[PDB]
């Protein structure tokens, strides 16, 4: 996990997240990557600690797409795309 790994999640989805054109298999893949292909504890707790500013970089974004983001790839995660979903008690 880096704060660039999360970028390959949200940066792809931004082109729908911010301007809802369409959800590419790229956005999905990056999302599912940070969520499932994270694998490690550091890739879970720290990854969320990057998601905060990545979903905080939202300039002209759409919050409705933030919850759609995980749904469109098929990753119903326990924690959410919330900027304050608490990233340490996720385990």
UniProtKB/Swiss-Prot annotation:
It holds the Pfam family Tryp_alpha_amyl. InterPro entries: Bifun_inhib/LTP/seed_sf, Bifunc_inhib/LTP/seed_store, Plant_nsLTP. It comes from the Eukaryota. Disulfide bonds join 3-50, 13-27, 28-73, 48-87. GO terms for molecular function: lipid binding. A 1,2-diacyl-sn-glycero-3-phosphocholine binds at residues 44, 79. GO terms for biological process: defense response to fungus; defense response to Gram-positive bacterium; killing of cells of another organism; lipid transport. SUPFAM superfamilies: Bifunctional inhibitor/lipid-transfer protein/seed storage 2S albumin. Keywords: Antibiotic, Antimicrobial, Disulfide bond, Fungicide, Lipid-binding, Transport. Belongs to the plant LTP family. Plant non-specific lipid-transfer proteins transfer phospholipids as well as galactolipids across membranes. May play a role in wax or cutin deposition in the cell walls of expanding epidermal cells and certain secretory tissues. Has antifungal activity against F.solani, F.oxysporum, P.aphanidermatum and S.rolfsii. Has antibacterial activity against the Gram-positive bacterium S.aureus but not against the Gram-negative bacterium S.typhimurium. Monomer. This is Non-specific lipid-transfer protein 1. It comes from Vigna radiata var. radiata (Mung bean).
């Amino acid at each position: 996990m880096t704060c660039g790994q999360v970028q390959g999640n949200l940066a792809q989805c931004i082109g729908f997240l911010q301007k809802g054109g369409v959800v590419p298999p790229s956005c999905c893949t990056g999302v599912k990557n940070i969520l499932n292909s994270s694998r490690t504890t550091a890739d879970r707790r720290a990854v969320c600690s990057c998601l905060k500013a990545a979903a905080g970089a939202v300039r002209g974004i759409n919050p409705n797409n933030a919850e759609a983001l995980p749904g469109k790839c098929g990753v119903n995660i326990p924690y959410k795309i919330s900027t304050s979903t608490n990233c340490n008690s996720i385990n």
